[PDB]
Ligand binder design. Structure first.
Ligand SMILES: CC[N+](C)(C)CCCC(=O)O
Ligand SMILES: CC[N+](C)(C)CCCC(=O)O
Ligand SMILES: O=C(O)CNC(=O)C(=O)O
Ligand SMILES: O=C(O)CNC(=O)C(=O)O
Ligand SMILES: NCCCCCCN
Ligand SMILES: NCCCCCCN
Ligand SMILES: [Zn+2]
Ligand SMILES: [Zn+2]
Ligand SMILES: [Zn+2]
Ligand SMILES: [Zn+2]
Ligand SMILES: [Zn+2]
Ligand SMILES: [Zn+2]
Ligand SMILES: [Zn+2]
Ligand SMILES: [Zn+2]
Lengths: 384, 384
């Protein structure tokens, strides 16, 4: 009933088509949008699933010249004699009602989000199962999107495991630190990560204007002397901050902070960026956290009177992240891989002891959320 | 005189340091920022040029306990007995005055912009000179940033030339269409680009949330039957649109448009994004154009009443781009490479004739603006 056409007619100076569906619901489609979306071979390249029609070809004041229909299709003539056919199901999916549009957006972008604190049950799957089975790889990526982290257990204790996951996704995101990179204590370290020091909560790579969306970290060697992992749900923390201290939230979501990274690794680099630490979308919703205290520049591009209040806000934010209700701590063992949303979570590590041999070694890499989401869309379709 | 210290003192409850320079100018530095930016080996990892100090270690209400100075350095004791030394030049550069901050930002981000229309003199350099000489590679990247395009002449007529430029920059930006890609007419084309059809003005890859910043296109084979290139300065066009039709500008800078790309190339993909066609920063300035009419989805996530006005605005924008005062047309010959700002310019191509052999072939690739800007910073330093 819902996608079967009972009546189709041109209305409002013929600038709209109305469909009455067999469940008595009505849908409205502007003529200009129909013309723009003609699926004929002149207008639309089927092999590419892409529009050939130019904006220049589109009369924005167009009206429908004629229309006939049956239960499954509408057939339209245009004023310049162009002819179009539209399928009922295709029309129904693209209905302009708020409910229909929102449903479709949920299907495209997987917005469901489960916020968490110290009660987190770390989602865990088997590494080889994820590589082998679409059902498991679907569970991996959909959980990564919804919860912001998944642990994979049973990988090897050798390099090359994150690269396998990269291929399973599609491809990894190359940066100045390489295609993959080795977290271990290094002489003349070019990054605080490559020491035995504590890493407080941070996101990776705010020195880029487009920080990595997803991070992969594979434990190859672990030390008994420290090196525990800690994570927090940045979106959950930002919610608490807005409630508890709206001025601090306002400062952190409005102040551009400069980040920097200069050195040599995969290539020689001199990188500079500006970000708001709490990055909001046009509707006021937090979409990314951009914060690494190590790479925050000494350069701070604000008037003198805004400085101390910024630090005071930052301190409140960090104190909230460190709260026993917010953080989750765990320790990686050799063969574990964590995969997480680097736009949402902040992560850290406990200090550990230096010595003469390497006592601790992670291999890491990055991926782009668009690459990950593409694989997720494909997997859903394959498993359903 | 300007970077020599005449007096340094703690002021305002010791929460500020004031420097009187020998030119009688004064600079103010908040105590909290000084403490945060202590360069000692406890606070700062010199090998990484990065901050070790944690936010947790920072007293946001800190004041200076004691201060002495000479002409070139300040020496500070803190309330908890921590001790810091700051160099005059380092302080002077980071002065919080609006003039000093703006000067420094210009140095980091190369904001100078030369808008253009049909009068454009296409900046042109030799390909091999750019690969060989830093002076020439500096001119290439600084012109690319300022004007939005540079032609390089004298490349080979063989694949692999854009890859050389990629290495000269640092690395290319991998996408689903490959590390590099071949623009030619293809059977069962997965993209309108890979046909002989006309491409109206577009930016590449708005189906990604982070479209490529810089595009490289190398002419390997060119046809006499068409295939001319066209470009327009999107920032210039957006300025004209705001002046001529503020409602159209408001619509295009506020409406989220869905983009899509589904197919198989380097990998199998199903990509979806949303962008505002005219993307403004927090100050109202245009920072990116996101528009490809081929990959604009049939899905359009707006209420029905906003549809026709959107198309009417889009048409006005396109008509402005097509204006004889706005566009610049030229034709690539084998051995030419164009490199351009894909966030600012829109580009297109004239249709040409299909036949049995390949009559036209470009090799293209992408790079990230942060990668390009890093190389530009490095080059400036090397050449100066
Ligand atoms: C690890 N690795 C060095 C690749 C990144 C650390 C985070 C950062 O520098 O922002
Ligand atoms: C060429 N290439 C196919 C790589 C991109 C075309 C632009 C686009 O699809 O947005
Ligand atoms: O070493 C760890 O456990 C965590 N490492 C990082 O967060 C990093 O390198 O950015
Ligand atoms: O073929 C040309 O001249 C231009 N090509 C493109 O703009 C493209 O492939 O996106
Ligand atoms: N079932 C209606 C088919 C209409 C075809 C018209 C072709 N111009
Ligand atoms: N020139 C002044 C040097 C001060 C050194 C103090 C060390 N604690
Ligand atoms: Zn149906
Ligand atoms: Zn058509
Ligand atoms: Zn990290
Ligand atoms: Zn290199
Ligand atoms: Zn000096
Ligand atoms: Zn110190
Ligand atoms: Zn293009
Ligand atoms: Zn693949």
């Amino acid at each position: 009933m819902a996608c079967t056409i009972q009546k189709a007619e041109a209305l409002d100076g013929a600038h709209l088509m109305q469909i009455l569906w067999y469940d008595e619901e009505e849908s409205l489609y502007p003529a200009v949008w129909l013309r723009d979306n003609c699926p004929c071979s002149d207008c639309y390249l089927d092999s590419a699933k892409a529009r050939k029609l130019l904006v220049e070809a589109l009369d924005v004041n167009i009206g429908i010249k004629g229309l006939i229909f049956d239960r499954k299709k509408v057939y339209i003539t245009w004023p310049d004699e162009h002819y179009s056919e539209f399928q009922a199901d295709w029309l129904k999916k693209r209905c302009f009602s708020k409910q229909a549009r929102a449903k479709l957006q949920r299907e495209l972008f997987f917005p469901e989000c489960q916020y968490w604190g110290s009660e987190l049950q770390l989602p865990t799957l088997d590494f080889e199962d994820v590589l082998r089975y679409d059902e498991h790889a679907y569970k991996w990526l959909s959980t990564l999107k919804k919860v912001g982290i998944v642990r994979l257990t049973g990988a090897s204790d050798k390099p090359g495991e994150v690269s396998k996951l990269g291929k399973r996704m599609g491809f990894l995101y190359l940066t100045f630190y390489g295609h993959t990179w080795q977290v271990q204590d290094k002489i003349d370290a070019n990054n605080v990560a490559y020491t035995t020091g504590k890493l407080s909560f941070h996101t990776d790579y705010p020195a880029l204007h487009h920080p990595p969306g997803v991070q992969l970290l594979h434990c190859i060697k672990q030390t008994v002397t420290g090196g525990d992992s800690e994570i927090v749900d940045g979106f959950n923390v930002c919610q608490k901050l807005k409630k508890n201290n709206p001025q601090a939230f306002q400062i952190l979501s409005s102040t551009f902070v400069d980040f920097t990274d200069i050195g040599v690794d995969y290539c020689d680099f001199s990188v500079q960026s500006k970000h708001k630490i709490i990055e909001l979308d046009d509707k006021g919703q937090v979409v990314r956290i951009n914060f690494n205290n190590a790479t925050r520049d000494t350069i701070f591009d604000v008037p003198v009177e805004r400085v101390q209040p910024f630090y005071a806000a930052l301190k409140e934010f960090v104190d909230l992240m460190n709260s026993k209700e917010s953080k989750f701590t765990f320790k990686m063992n050799p063969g574990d891989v964590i995969t997480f949303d680097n736009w949402r979570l902040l992560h850290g590590r406990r200090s550990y002891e230096a010595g003469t041999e390497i006592s601790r070694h992670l291999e890491g890499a990055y991926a782009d959320w668009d690459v990950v989401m593409s694989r997720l869309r494909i997997l859903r379709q394959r498993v359903e």
